Amino acid sequence: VIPDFMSFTSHIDELYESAKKQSGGKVADYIPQLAKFSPDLWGVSVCTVDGQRHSIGDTKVPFCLQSCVKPLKYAIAVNDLGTEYVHRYVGKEPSGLRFNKLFLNEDDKPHNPMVNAGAIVVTSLIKQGVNNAEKFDYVMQFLNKMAGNEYVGFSNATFQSERESGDRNFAIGYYLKEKKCFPEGTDMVGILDFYFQLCSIEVTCESASVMAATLANGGFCPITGERVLSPEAVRNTLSLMHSCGMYDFSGQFAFHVGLPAKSGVAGGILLVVPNVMGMMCWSPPLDKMGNSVKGIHFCHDLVSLCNFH
Amino acid sequence: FVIPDFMSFTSHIDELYESAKKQSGGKVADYIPQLAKFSPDLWGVSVCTVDGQRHSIGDTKVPFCLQSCVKPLKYAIAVNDLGTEYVHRYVGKEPSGLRFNKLFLNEDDKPHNPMVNAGAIVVTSLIKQGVNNAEKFDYVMQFLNKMAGNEYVGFSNATFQSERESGDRNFAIGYYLKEKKCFPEGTDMVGILDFYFQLCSIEVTCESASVMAATLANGGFCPITGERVLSPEAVRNTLSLMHSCGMYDFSGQFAFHVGLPAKSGVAGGILLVVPNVMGMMCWSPPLDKMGNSVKGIHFCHDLVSLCNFH
Amino acid sequence: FVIPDFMSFTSHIDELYESAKKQSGGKVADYIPQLAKFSPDLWGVSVCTVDGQRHSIGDTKVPFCLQSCVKPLKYAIAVNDLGTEYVHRYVGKEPSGLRFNKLFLNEDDKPHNPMVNAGAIVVTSLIKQGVNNAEKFDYVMQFLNKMAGNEYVGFSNATFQSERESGDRNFAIGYYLKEKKCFPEGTDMVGILDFYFQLCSIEVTCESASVMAATLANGGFCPITGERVLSPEAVRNTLSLMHSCGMYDFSGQFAFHVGLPAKSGVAGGILLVVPNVMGMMCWSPPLDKMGNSVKGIHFCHDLVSLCNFH
After folding, report:
1. N6-acetyllysine (modified residue): where (chains B, C)?
2. What number of C-beta contacts closer than 8 Å exist between A and C?
3. How many domains is chain B partitioned into structurally?
């Protein structure tokens, strides 16, 4: 794909230093398990679709996939069930408001699988009729296949704090239950618990870069070469990420970078350059809107230097 | 040389034309006689690549007005004349998530994007401040003629009169914008709305609109004459805005199925751009419930299902 | 060093491993699918001397949950944090003489020992009072990482969920203890039970568990790092409790044959300590009718027959 992973790596290693010289803002402070990471942590990982890899910085420190798991769970649900069944319950258009807003569209359905309501509904669609242990096992095996048997684990310390502080998520779940937005025969409390478990899965920059690369490749793992996702699933996931991946900021992002990227509250930016590569940027500092300052600066510098877009 | 066949491509184009011709249609205007006089049987397609290759099928010689297909063009003109930083100082770039005619602004008291009515009015105001309306219209007309490669671009007086005597929602939006002080210093709101109504009444043919879209596809260089008419930044911003909020609230769903920058007009015209490949204009007066031609939507869906694109 | 040669001893350990490998086995879990998916062929042994020397034979890199081998560690943590006199104010120090999952207290209406389920629940309640479960788990994990010499210690979520929806007897025991006022003032029983289920789901390998047993044998000093992790009173009380009722109603027979402090879990794990000598961990999913690994029991018996120890 890139016949210059030498000078290209030099460009990456200079954008890294360019983005390192930032102060930024806060980290998180909503749970103690994320307001502990040192602000000076800053790492970048890149995996091309041909298997070539390159990492620079603190790319070996595990961190939770707080909000970067929504594209992956949506892809899993679409692959298991299908586009028409998955979108029978959720929409495919941006809402124009914050991700934690308590309102539905004109059809009394969640606007998209990227807002909290859509994410909860999509979580309710995975492996119906089975207990949470088997659901978690299935999702973890799918993620291990996605990342090419890299480091994927569970952070129980984050899961306990997140589970006892999701009042807005509980309100959204009860609102969805009252409006009959769930498939028949679903326990809302168990669905919310499984959602909290999924949000607590932790990876490094290497495994996240491999996941982004396998999304770019079209369901084929660049390292192993095993098909993990159907083309329809990855295409729909990329479309959703481009449309409403950054919530109300998304359009502005598409105005400047124009690439499918997803941002988490743990200071993680997972971006995909289709047919080219997948990258993960980690910087626990966050700005006022909810994105890592170093990650956003790196994305802007990357799109300014190389054409991409 | 981007598509070096133009024989099987045109064959598939005609096949899709015939397939989409079977659609019944729908209500066209039902509110004014100017747009209600067009028979539903009219349906034409025009394709122009970035090499000068042209192909027109159906009835592509019947002029029609550019109701909402002129917003990307006026935004591109404003960006080219002024600059991205200045033009986006007054309007936003994120989709609103509601109808195009809703009376509300974002957290910065600015129009959400140049594609909504308020954004279009502000962008119209931004063009050639402190000049007579006749000079502004002449400038825009010559810019459109240069962009279309000296094709047929004209004016429809009856349509302009109908819009100016029927469009009071735009007057409400303009007064609301003037109250919030969203206009540049030293502008007249009534003249701005008159110029907006004049711009909305410009009429073109299908081949001229296809060349106009192919100009954006090529990157500011006219596929026919080869003269540079737009800066690359203006074309890039126009394409980004069209992909984000080209079809308003429905736009995202469009991007889920077709995934191409397209703009829809009240006069049943779909102007779509395949970047670095080509541009198409599909005219079909009959409209669906949300203001889009059923034949144009069906043609776009069939095309994206046939060829890879997206 | 404790073992001057550590070369013939390694050969003896290998011979013991091969001798014990010939056993057929039995059932594994039969109650949850997380522990029922392990193949019977898995069989590993890890030995760590108090001076840092290590030796592992077999599948010693496969993680497994510390089902019932965490009770000595949690009791040691509680004693180190609080004190011997405060910890035993709530639990006894004598064998009950019956099964571990028995709903009865001694003459003082207290759990018989910290090894039965009631004593384990009370000791869990005694750890880090007045704090939420997240910080309790963080503290316990930090203590285990310090004790294990920064080896592999992690969490198994699927096993944890299985325990949550499979632990009816533990809920009955917790309610029985709550009725009899066996808990410290200001405690939520359901939170204590959830924390107990979390603690039982911590997973390690044979290497880390061997290191933990080595620190227990060394008197709170980790053989690898050399950092004091436990007080002498804590390790002495833990060893005394393990020797008294480590294997429940079978423990006496163990003390009649092996005579070493050992703890057995339902995940096919035997954690044994030879004081002032070394610590060992044996893993074999195959279990007998009494809840012990057949390979581990055979290995322990033949080891105590070959070398003096006892």
Report:
1. 93
2. 46
3. 1
